[PDB]
Amino acid sequence: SQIRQNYSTEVEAAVNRLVNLYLRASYTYLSLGFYFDRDDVALEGVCHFFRQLAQQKMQGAERLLKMQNQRGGRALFQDLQKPSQDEWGTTPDAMKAAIVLEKSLNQALLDLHALGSAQADPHLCDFLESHFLDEEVKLIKKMGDHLTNIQRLVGSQAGLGEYLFERLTL
Amino acid sequence: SQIRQNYSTEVEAAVNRLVNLYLRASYTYLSLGFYFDRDDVALEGVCHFFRQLAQQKMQGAERLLKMQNQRGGRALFQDLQKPSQDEWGTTPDAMKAAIVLEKSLNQALLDLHALGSAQADPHLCDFLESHFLDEEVKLIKKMGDHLTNIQRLVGSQAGLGEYLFERLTL
Amino acid sequence: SQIRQNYSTEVEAAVNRLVNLYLRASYTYLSLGFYFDRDDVALEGVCHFFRQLAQQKMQGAERLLKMQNQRGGRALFQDLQKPSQDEWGTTPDAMKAAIVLEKSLNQALLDLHALGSAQADPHLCDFLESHFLDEEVKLIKKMGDHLTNIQRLVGSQAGLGEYLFERLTL
Amino acid sequence: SQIRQNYSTEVEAAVNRLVNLYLRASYTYLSLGFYFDRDDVALEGVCHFFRQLAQQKMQGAERLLKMQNQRGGRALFQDLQKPSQDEWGTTPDAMKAAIVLEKSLNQALLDLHALGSAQADPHLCDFLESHFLDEEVKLIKKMGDHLTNIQRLVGSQAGLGEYLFERLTL
């Protein structure tokens, strides 16, 4: 490559893997969202919450891909596994799944940051710090807040609490 | 002092003590507020309510300090004790703590007013009446109204009631 | 904690300590400011300069507290010691005290950054770099510039120079 | 009187005396102001400062007179003594004279407040507290601040300091 500079093959490959993780996440969120749009689930605010996350994760993938090209790496795509479930249970079940999923993304970001630090790649580290790490922390805090709220509600009365959360928070 | 007139040493000292009480109150409210921002508490409206009070109590301190200088007194600061608790329980527990705290401020204002009256210091009495005493009465009435509402709600169903109060009142 | 991830107990505690330092700084600035509002000191621009810093340091504390909760740490408050002086001398004395104080904050930030780096906590490092470290460098440069200006003025004629600095710089 | 109620003859007379004091003050300020407009004094900002005070003291007299009629008292005017000096010296001399004068007004207000309190006349006490006592405290604090500034300046270099104060403060 005529532009590549200080960009290890290890980081290049890890970036491609992270793209696959972000796209898998996006896919998982599309499934979550449309589950809550089922007529026998019917929680619009929950559907919208997950559809917005699907979009966000796709935008994350796109940012990674743009950076891969900026650095002179080569994007390589792999098969995308389907989401882990076909049906996602109640709102708390779904919110717990989402936090698991985000923590896995976040750990993948931390791992890539560590690789970048080992490879002495400050551009990578800046990119991740600026566009991903705080966004993940903020998102996970929001999900934890949601989970606490939903649990407090459905602990009182499950159906009623699920409705109220969807109406008054989402 | 070239400006001091009719300003007793007793009032000067009591004003400094009251500043310490207002700053301690402010500190207590900062703690309350950030407690309700914990991911395992997660009541945004409660956090905002207490953060706003922290600001209000700081503004009270500042007004006292401005008056101390206007009268030719000398501000003296003391150590500020930490708030009485590290964790503040449920919304009713916190609202009860806040009313205790405000009643203590109010009693300190009444005591200073009484001292001013004994010292024949009408400027002090006017200052307190105009900027503090009605504000405290209004605030305590609001807190009592909140407490009644929260108690009525959590008496019905604790988790659900706490959510609804935070969503629909705060 | 349901959200905490890669957030050491060492960093959690150091963040709480830093909050105490920022609040102590805020308190020191409140004292500085109201000193310069005394009728026998009477330098409005100096009072405003320090009152604005008091606000800034409080905002720093608040940002730290928000981050502590975002990461799933638990804010813990300690007693706040009173400022180091009751009276703050002339403008150069006060500006020197402020630079001492800011350098101590800055060293505490650098120490926390070093701890974060040792704990492999890139989110912490980004947070500090983005919201604190440059702000401190900029502030210290401004204070140094002020001190040089005040010293040059009061070296010529003390009273006159102090007035002119307050009128024409602040 | 068809409207007079709870308005003692003692307060009525003291109000008339206070009017004479406010008008005497106004007269003193007119003299101060025009002194600083002399071609051999020539401090415009000082002239404006005192001319504005002359207006303020006249407005005070007018407010007292309006209140005297509101209560069913009868305004009685006495001769107005000329100001204590024909020439008023330097800016610090003049500012010291003004603070003496304001402290005398303030003591007269406090004395009338005390009389009102002894006569159980809450309307009088409210009137004084609301329209006079804080205004006097604020004014005296401003004068003290000015005096400190002027003294610091003329202690450095008298002529130069007097000019700078007039240009940059007034």
UniProtKB/Swiss-Prot annotation, chains A, B, C, D:
The residue ranges of the Ferritin-like diiron domain are 5-154
Q: What is its main location?
A: cytoplasm
Lineage top rank: taxon: Eukaryota
UniProt record, GO biological process: intracellular iron ion homeostasis; iron ion transport
A GO molecular-function descriptor: ferric iron binding
Which GO terms of the cellular component aspect does the record hold? autolysosome; autophagosome; cytoplasm; cytoplasmic vesicle; ferritin complex
Keyword field contains Iron: yes
Residues spanning the signal sequence: none
Which keywords describe this protein according to UniProt?
Answer: Acetylation, Cytoplasm, Cytoplasmic vesicle, Iron, Iron storage, Lysosome, Metal-binding
Xref: PROSITE patterns: FERRITIN_1, FERRITIN_2, FERRITIN_LIKE
The record's note on quaternary structure and interaction partners says: Oligomer of 24 subunits. There are two types of subunits: L (light) chain and H (heavy) chain. The major chain can be light or heavy, depending on the species and tissue type. The functional molecule forms a roughly spherical shell with a diameter of 12 nm and contains a central cavity into which the insoluble mineral iron core is deposited. Interacts with NCOA4.
Also noted in the record is:
In horse spleen the light chain is the major chain.
Q: Per the similarity annotation, which family is this?
A: Belongs to the ferritin family.
Question: Can you name this protein?
Answer: Ferritin light chain
Source organism of this protein record: Equus caballus (Horse)
